[PDB]
Amino acid sequence: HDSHEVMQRLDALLPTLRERAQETEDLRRIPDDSMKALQETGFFRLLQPEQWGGYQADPVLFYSAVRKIASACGSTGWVSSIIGVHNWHLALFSQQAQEDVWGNDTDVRISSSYAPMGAGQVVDGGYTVNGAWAWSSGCDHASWAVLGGPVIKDGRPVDFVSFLIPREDYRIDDVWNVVGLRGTGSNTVVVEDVFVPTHRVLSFKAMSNLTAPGLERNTAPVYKMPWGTIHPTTISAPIVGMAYGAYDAHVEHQGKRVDDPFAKVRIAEASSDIDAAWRQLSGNVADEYALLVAGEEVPFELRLRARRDQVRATGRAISSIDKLFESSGATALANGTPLQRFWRDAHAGRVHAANDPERAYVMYGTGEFGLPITDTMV
Amino acid sequence: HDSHEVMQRLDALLPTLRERAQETEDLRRIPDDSMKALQETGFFRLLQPEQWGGYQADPVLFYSAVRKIASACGSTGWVSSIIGVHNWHLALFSQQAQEDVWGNDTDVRISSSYAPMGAGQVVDGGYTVNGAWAWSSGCDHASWAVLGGPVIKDGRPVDFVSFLIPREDYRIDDVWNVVGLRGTGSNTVVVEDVFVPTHRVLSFKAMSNLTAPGLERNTAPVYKMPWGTIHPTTISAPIVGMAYGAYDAHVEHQGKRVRDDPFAKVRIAEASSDIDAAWRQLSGNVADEYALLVAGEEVPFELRLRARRDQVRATGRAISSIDKLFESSGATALANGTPLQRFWRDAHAGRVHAANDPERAYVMYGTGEFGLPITDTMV
Amino acid sequence: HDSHEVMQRLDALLPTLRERAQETEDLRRIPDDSMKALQETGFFRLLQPEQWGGYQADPVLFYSAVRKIASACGSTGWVSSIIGVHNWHLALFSQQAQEDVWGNDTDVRISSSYAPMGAGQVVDGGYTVNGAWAWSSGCDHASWAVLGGPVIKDGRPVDFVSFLIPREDYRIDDVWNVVGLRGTGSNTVVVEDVFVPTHRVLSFKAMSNLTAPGLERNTAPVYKMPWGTIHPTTISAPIVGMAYGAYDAHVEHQGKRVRAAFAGEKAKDDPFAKVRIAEASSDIDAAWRQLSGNVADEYALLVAGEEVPFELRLRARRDQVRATGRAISSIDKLFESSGATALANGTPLQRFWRDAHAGRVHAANDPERAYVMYGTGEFGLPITDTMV
Amino acid sequence: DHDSHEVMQRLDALLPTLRERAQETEDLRRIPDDSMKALQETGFFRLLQPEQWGGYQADPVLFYSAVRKIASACGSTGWVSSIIGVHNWHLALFSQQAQEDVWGNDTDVRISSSYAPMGAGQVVDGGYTVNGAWAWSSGCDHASWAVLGGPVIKDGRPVDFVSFLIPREDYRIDDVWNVVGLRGTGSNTVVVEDVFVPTHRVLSFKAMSNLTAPGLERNTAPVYKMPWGTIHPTTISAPIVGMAYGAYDAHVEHQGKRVRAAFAKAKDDPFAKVRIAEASSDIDAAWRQLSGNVADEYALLVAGEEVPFELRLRARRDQVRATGRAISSIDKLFESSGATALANGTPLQRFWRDAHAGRVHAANDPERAYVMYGTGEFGLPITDTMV
């Protein structure tokens, strides 16, 4: 994938992203000029359908792009992954929803908050939505949001969906005050008595049934990938990328500085484990995609292995960054320097629901025993 | 130890230290109020000689006090431990040096920087000292510094000593800009062509030979404790304390949330057990050394080796436990201004101290087990 | 505690135990002469009541003795611990049951199997017991067994008790065929349609309620210790002792190698081998400090006429399963470091390694069981697990 | 795919028998004759043998995949298979005349080894005088030649490190194998006393690493240009990875039955499930890196390109680590299984002992590889030849 025009353009941009990393942290928001430059590489177009001028790319290319960006700036990589994957999600909505978003401008971005921090009440022609959806990474750089929650009919939940809402109908509250991923501006999308029409709503069950309405026109194999791989991989990929960036920064600084065999061992351990994380994370995605391209269903056993290795990829990345940070010692404490930033950033990314390791591990083991699984994050 | 008057007074202070932990980080040094409150508890007097109004206390009492303070505020616990132990170090200097410092005011504090970031050239009546000694925790709150470095004679190092220098003779550079232990104000003490008289310089070899001049008047057994246990334990005790604080904060917060996740329960079992193990060994080795001294017996080298082995490991267990708790807590723990992420950053910052390097102690311990020569003096 | 007469006599015996370790494995049984020598030290009397000529000792002394024995021979240490603790358990049974066992010979030994592998049906005068109780360590060396199981009444289980049964009423089946603790002879006690009188049955609930009938005459504070600490610590202490033995064997062998090595040899300056030794010794010591520490704290409270608080019983279980874990992790580090030399059959370190991993399987070593319970306690949620 | 290769299909048919006979193999303290004959029949030993001798001169990933498969059924048989099989690669680098000495009448002849220096050869006219007692020669009872590692002695000093190729008529095998794991490997001692070894039967490891080994003239297949530093240590890690796959399958089979038969501990034990997740993921990571590094090296050679030193360093890094991941994973499964797993004669405790025995091999020492890798990352000089 390194030869792809998008990858080559991203390569040219990395020094800019590194130089801006502290400013990004300080301002608690990705700089507009970084997002513009990322847009210009074609990055956001990677998972966007061909009908909207997108690449509808091999998903490994997308995650490889994310890994690269995150290796320069953890917050920019995190935002890039999440915002970029929403272009995949929107491909599954109705054609009319896609036209609402992209009909005049195919570079329009969408942010998200998928945890149920609000709900939609059934009304004529759609839903009345209320909520305060926290943790919307990069939400200032989007003009729509996809927001997860139950549909309420006659007082009971009857579906679990994403509501697509334009920014004219919501307020962003600046609350992002955290120890890591400070640059992500993961602020809160506040929705008050908002009408959302039916065509702008997509059930996660329709997605997993392979009946999402977007599939009729967006026929590319990438859109048949399971959400339980696509979304959690978008969360792990940037953390793996952070580990690459941390590794390179550490070895560069230490190389110059260098009879300590222990520092060498930590470097060996970290580099091996980062590589293992990437091999599994990208490998499971490649295997799923190969089956789809061959017209096959992705076997449930593969979806389970994907989740198993994906949470573990995050853990390997964090363990590896921890080793390097610890080994670096006093010099790494200095504010403004890359290694301590990757460290705080990776630990912040770790909190995402999709990174909880026992959730995935317990499910995987349940499958190995042929016992029923009700968890939908797969 | 919990019933000691100093410990009871420190208990009364903890809520305040907790409340003020963020403002302490933001100030990048300990607030004046906190140092004054700590002083008024008698804490700094714990290891100070009785001749100066001190308690010359059981060293376990001192480290228990540090553990308690650090459980409320990591930066304050770190500074308290380091500044407090300098009162023990000064007890070993000449009577005249102790008089210079405490002769008019027995509450005077001393900061340090023991890494060789400067040196003293031999001259008539003393030394000419030059250096820029970084990482002097709490230096803004002291009016003297003890500074480690070689004595230079005929262009060769001939001793390794601490130079005791009053604040009138040095400049403090505000450079403290770090990810953790932010409130410690571990600034840089800059010394330029300063005369230090002979009586204000103490060799670490005299100390380890049990010939420090201060022993003649300060006869309490605590002053015969080995530096290789006293100094490194100073650096581990606050980190263990941070882990106790991190644990209490996490269980309080989580308990409320919980009132079926067996994994969160397992992490708290692992963390509480490992913190307790760290404290049992750290305090146990100190207690064992001290018991021998109280009995008029020598501290055997094997015990000094065990102390170093377990002390670096105590720091490791404390950090590993904090990591577990912080991980387990998840999203709620990222918020700026909340205790758990602060303890996490603070513990990882304390980890960088030379006396916490674990392989250094482990390799020495192993060398000892094989009956091979040891030249490392940090023991 | 090493000035105690029992400890001094055990010290004198250790070389014999070490020399016999391979034979003990090969025969799958503790040698009769080892059990006799152990008896002659006074070891089995340590937790036995004063009325029967016993020491009714500080429990830390008992576990210290166990630690010592197990450091010489893992199987002998394992058997010694479990058989020794049965003398504590019997102190809680009725006076009449103790008289049945010790009335003519206060050196009689009892084996056990506390997992429910049989049951007792209520009948006039007691119970009809049926079972096949596996894993009865050292059962050949005992003339009674205490066997854990439910009482059946109206064809429902109504209590969980130990049935005290003499050897004339059971058969031992030799089935012990395992990868470690081979010497323990942990065979199966088979009980067929046997009458067990009321006075020879003791409920664990009665024990926990401090209403066990033996407490009336056996008033020493050690008998008020909680089973949830006493029995699991009897399982961890020998594994900790195995770790001490493994450590000493490793350092003795390696020390000779390194001192005999030449200037440029790997063995002369291997910092990694040194680090593994530091890690192992520290973690073994931590295991012992907590395991013995929690026992000491419980006992001190009892000596002071106080109850043992539940929070302490929870900490005891937490640290006890962890002590087993620390001991095994440490042996693993040493065995791995030793490398090719350690593979040789008949040598001590690989034996301690297999032995510790075998001891690990005991129900009382399952770490998540204790950890989850401890965490439940910290959250102020209800606990129903009785192994505490 | 490798799984469709004729040798792999034939090995598949043999696995149940190898599993069944694992205990009798340990008890015999060497591989049974039947097993070696069956393995020979599959074509397995021919995998890395040159085509001029009827061999497959195969993609080395195919060879290590075969080893993984065999080792998943029987740790000792997989260990011997890997080692004996790789000697057919090593012999391909010796002179044509040496290969002719070994295979000129019977191309099924096997060679054992002991590469650690446990002997030496003194320079004499026409060759060397060799003396040694080379321990740990896995499967030596099943070979009629040995390749023995040691220095060459010239004017009383060691001038080169070579392998001496010696026929069985010239050495004695001492039955000494008495160990806690890999019991079935029969890793006995090859004793050599005042033996003449001609020049054409001696191969310098430096000649190999310089790409000047004489066997390369006729044996031109790209597999023979692979670096020894990857080839030999991978032969030591691959069977341990296979043992972990076998341990995993045995454990999940046994446990799955238990759990599905359980009623309202085995019914809902999330910890057992986590150990399964951890072990499976780490075993997979081990194999991906171990096989991936070999694949990347081989792809370069197939393309007529050089294998960069950086890749050789990564290979050693991941290879020692693969052994560690395999052992850690087996440990997890054995611990989780608990009491049931202690029974003698059952598979999981055997894989556990076997993996811990394989761990002692020089090529598995992990700090050795890790320190070397770190030295390379700093751009500092490396003198270690195991790369």
From Swiss-Prot, chain D:
Keyword terms: Aromatic hydrocarbons catabolism, Flavoprotein, FMN, Lipid degradation, Lipid metabolism, Monooxygenase, Oxidoreductase, Steroid metabolism
InterPro entries: Acyl-CoA_dehydrogenase (IPR050741), Acyl-CoA_DH_C (IPR013107), Acyl-CoA_Oxase/DH_mid-dom_sf (IPR046373), AcylCo_DH-like_C (IPR036250), AcylCoA_DH/ox_N (IPR013786), AcylCoA_DH/ox_N_sf (IPR037069), AcylCoA_DH/oxidase_NM_dom_sf (IPR009100), HsaA (IPR054617)
Top-level EC class as recorded in UniProt: oxidoreductase
Pathway: Lipid metabolism; steroid biosynthesis
One matching Pfam family: Acyl-CoA_dh_2
SUPFAM superfamilies for this protein: Acyl-CoA dehydrogenase C-terminal domain-like, Acyl-CoA dehydrogenase NM domain-like
GO cellular component entries: cytoplasm
Signal peptide coordinates: none
GO molecular function, one term: 3-hydroxy-9,10-secoandrosta-1,3,5(10)-triene-9,17-dione monooxygenase activity
Reactions performed catalytically: 3-hydroxy-9,10-secoandrosta-1,3,5(10)-triene-9,17-dione + FMNH2 + O2 = 3,4-dihydroxy-9,10-secoandrosta-1,3,5(10)-triene-9,17-dione + FMN + H2O + H(+)
Gene3D superfamilies (alphabetical): Acyl-CoA dehydrogenase/oxidase, N-terminal domain, Butyryl-CoA Dehydrogenase, subunit A, domain 2, Butyryl-CoA Dehydrogenase, subunit A, domain 3
CDD domains according to UniProt: NcnH (cd01159)
Domain of life: Bacteria
Family: Belongs to the HpaH/HsaA monooxygenase family.
Self-association state and partner proteins as the record states: Homotetramer. HsaAB monooxygenase consists of an oxygenase component HsaA and a reductase component HsaB.
Protein name, entry field: Flavin-dependent monooxygenase, oxygenase subunit HsaA
Native source organism of the sequence: Rhodococcus jostii (strain RHA1)
Gene (name only): hsaA
